[PDB]
Design a protein around this nucleic acid. Structure first.
Ligand code: MG
Ligand code: MG
Ligand code: MG
Ligand code: MG
Ligand code: MG
Ligand code: MG
Ligand code: MG
Ligand code: MG
Ligand code: MG
Ligand code: MG
Ligand code: ZN
Lengths: 216, 37, 176, 144
RNA sequence: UUGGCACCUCGAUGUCGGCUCAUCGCAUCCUGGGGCUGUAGUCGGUCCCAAGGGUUGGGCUGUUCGCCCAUUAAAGCGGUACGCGAGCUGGGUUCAGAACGUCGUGAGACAGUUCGGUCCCUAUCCGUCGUGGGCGUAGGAAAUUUGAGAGGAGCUGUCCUU
RNA sequence: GGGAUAAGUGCUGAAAGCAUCUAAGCAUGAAGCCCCCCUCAAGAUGAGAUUUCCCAACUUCGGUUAUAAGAUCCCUCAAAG
């Protein structure tokens, strides 16, 4: 069981061995370092904390997240690493196989590996029931004054309320999503990229987490 | 299995027993298996 | 309870020792240990044992009977053991031993493997007579039940796995 | 002439007790513990103030039921979502969360008031024979 | 369900059907597990467990029903103000026009028919869907987190081989 | 895939010398139950955990102070709205 963090670069395609067209997502996964090692003894569970994508060193009057603050710098310097942009834990890996400070190269994965990919899906802002919940429209003609409304929200005296879970307009997307059983099509160690079969959640430049697929 | 409120012997080989709180008939003849309900 | 009142004969080679409720019986074939009803007393004679119940209540009579029966079963199991014999009916229905486990081929598209358990021995004769031998009467019965439930007897031709002495009701399958 | 003593925070002394659930009947232990938590055993009992004592219950996993309650006493709860009933038998709850079993049985015998909630907060339940409150120097308490 | 009663509402509790959105029961239509069979097999019959999910498009009619066409694993039965008109429609039905049959001397009338015929409301509270601020969490902070709980999901055809 | 079950299927077994799936005891057994899979989640006031960062003066010596780490105002923006 393996894990790594990258950035979604974009989609493209490759031709397989029989000429089949394989859509792929390019994930750039450079600069992964084991920052912390969590154990049952100290933390109560086993996991490796991985930091991804070096950021700049601490400076006095930093005004953005580009520069590490002192807490983050101390945390990373404990691992001996440069401060990192994204930090995520992998509980699915065997901690005994990792050392704090160790590099996690794209080569940990091999072509054919089946993987789960997790990301934050693209945001859509405030959306209505048709888009957000895929509901049916009312008639567009024949006297209708019901086109994109969400429909009845309850019944009557029984129950004199709307039940929790009613589907209504609201903010759409920006949710953690895991797509299961994708495949590693190619690993390019020179460019530090993984070609994953299919599409993965999130915008371009978005953080993606690749793990060995839980189901097998 | 016959499930019915009236459970009783159908032939001389039927045997009235009680299992798990339920009156039943067991018999060599499978047609005569009964369970009260 | 006549069964409860009845005394258990111990063969000279069989030794029964009690530890409170828990009892254990050793003999030529093996050792059997179990915990008996805590409210039953035991008169341990040199050559025999007797179960004694405190009262004549319903519960005491039931437990006296069952305790006597269980202890006698343990003694006879260590002495002589217990055996259950099944037979296979149906052309092509066969059994064989894959070492200690028993593999059956009974009209399925795959063989069925039954893994032997501790203190139990399977033996196949003529490829169509399985016998389970053990010291635990209960264990022997359970494993024989599993073997037979792999494919029990169907009524129209008797095919399947049956106990050798079992009577299988027969039906006239086809009529005009 | 009005002369009834009224306890208040200046003169209330709360002790710590330990009660062993092992071999005890759930409801009977619970009613007694509730009395202790409410302070009903003190001659200075004052309804508008917490005069009760702290209780630690140990060996909650060894509490016992009569009859067929182990499989037939069912605890229901509702998630406030349509169709959101969830149930657990008393035996299953004793296996998986005896602390909650004892806590809930006892807290069902305390009033649903602010003071009742506060008083129920003075209960500590543990499935095993150890508790982490040796600092409070609790005394063993014999039921009945 | 058809009714009986006349207890809430006549300083108004909108009424059929459909649309949108569901939610619950099980007396279960399919799928899952069984017993019996006048169960050879393939199919069936009947009963028991089981409510997780699933349970179709059209023709006619305002229709609900119902019949029909063609499918499907199946085309379940009920409750929720015969769920849902401050969410939609407004074809039926009980305003004013007109007409036929009928009754009536007549004015008119008919759970007879026919053609036509105004559906208002800027959400205060609870409720529900999202999204911020405060304070708390016994110092002030940046990250990574356990998971008590909660929600989601949960369906199935056909073919090949044996 | 796992655990516990329903209807069932049994093993051993007396009450009741027999019989009996049941009383004690031991198995097995559903798309169902609890998990396993996905998501939210410590206002879980029971407010949890780990790593890292900051750490002095003045004081009616209770306390205060602006500062520290840090975060903002304001400004350029978008993958967010
Ligand atoms: Mg439409
Ligand atoms: Mg319009
Ligand atoms: Mg009858
Ligand atoms: Mg009024
Ligand atoms: Mg039912
Ligand atoms: Mg109404
Ligand atoms: Mg209605
Ligand atoms: Mg309304
Ligand atoms: Mg009209
Ligand atoms: Mg006339
Ligand atoms: Zn009979």
């Amino acid at each position: 069981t393996k894990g790594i963090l990258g950035r979604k670069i974009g989609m493209t395609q490759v031709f397989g061995e029989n000429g089949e067209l394989i859509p792929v997502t390019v994930v750039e996964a450079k600069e992964n370092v084991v920052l912390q090692k969590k154990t049952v003894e100290v933390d109560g569970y086993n996991a490796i904390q991985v930091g991804f994508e070096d950021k700049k060193a601490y400076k006095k009057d930093a005004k953005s997240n580009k520069y590490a603050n002192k807490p983050a710098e101390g945390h990373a310097k404990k691992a001996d690493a440069a401060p990192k942009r994204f930090i995520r834990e992998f509980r699915n890996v065997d901690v005994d196989a990792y050392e704090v400070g160790q590099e996690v190269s794209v080569d940990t994965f091999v072509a054919g590996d089946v993987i789960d990919v997790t990301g934050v899906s693209k945001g859509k802002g405030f959306q209505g029931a048709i888009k957000r919940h895929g509901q049916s429209r009312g008639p567009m003609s024949h006297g209708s004054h019901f086109h994109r409304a969400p429909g009845s929200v309850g019944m009557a005296s029984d129950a004199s309320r709307v039940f929790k879970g009613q589907k209504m307009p609201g903010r759409m997307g920006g949710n953690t999503v895991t797509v299961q059983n994708l495949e590693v099509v190619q690993v390019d160690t020179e460019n530090k990229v993984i070609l994953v079969k299919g599409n993965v959640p999130g915008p371009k430049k978005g953080l993606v987490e690749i793990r060995t697929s839980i189901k097998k | 299995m016959k499930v019915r409120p009236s459970v009783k012997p159908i032939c001389e080989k039927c045997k009235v027993i009680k299992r798990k709180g339920k009156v039943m008939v067991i018999c060599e003849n499978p047609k005569h298996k009964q369970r009260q309900g | 309870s006549r069964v409860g009142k009845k005394i258990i004969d111990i063969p000279s080679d069989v030794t029964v020792t009690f530890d409170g409720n828990h009892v254990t019986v050793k003999g030529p074939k093996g050792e059997l240990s179990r915990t008996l009803n805590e409210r039953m007393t035991f008169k341990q004679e040199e050559n025999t044992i007797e179960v004694v119940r405190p009262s004549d209540s319903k519960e005491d009579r039931t437990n006296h009977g069952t305790t006597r029966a269980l202890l006698n079963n343990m003694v006879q199991g260590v002495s002589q053991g217990y055996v259950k014999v099944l037979e296979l009916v149906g052309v092509g229905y066969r059994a064989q031993m894959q070492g200690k486990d028993l593999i059956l081929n009974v009209g399925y598209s795959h063989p069925v493997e039954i893994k032997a358990e501790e203190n139990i021995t399977f033996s196949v004769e003529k490829n169509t007579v399985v016998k389970v031998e053990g010291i635990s009467k209960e264990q022997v019965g359970a494993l024989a039940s599993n073997i037979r439930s792999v494919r029990p007897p169907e009524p129209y031709k008797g095919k399947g796995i049956r106990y050798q002495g079992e009577y299988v009701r027969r039906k006239e399958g086809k009529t005009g | 002439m009005r002369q009834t003593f009224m306890a208040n925070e200046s003169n209330i002394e709360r002790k710590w007790y330990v009660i062993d659930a092992e071999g005890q009947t759930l409801g009977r232990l619970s009613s007694e513990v509730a009395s202790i938590l409410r302070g009903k055993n003190k001659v200075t009992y004052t309804p508008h103030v917490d005069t009760g004592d702290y209780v630690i219950v140990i060996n909650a996993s060894k509490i016992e039921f009569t009859g067929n309650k182990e499989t037939d006493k069912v605890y229901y709860r509702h998630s406030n979502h349509p169709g959101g009933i969830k149930s657990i038998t008393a035996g299953e709850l004793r296996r998986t969360n005896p602390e909650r079993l004892i806590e809930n049985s006892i807290k069902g015998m305390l009033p649903s008031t602010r003071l009742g909630e506060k008083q129920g907060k003075k209960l500590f339940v543990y499935g095993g024979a150890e508790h982490p409150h040796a600092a409070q120097q609790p005394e063993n308490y014999e039921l009945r």
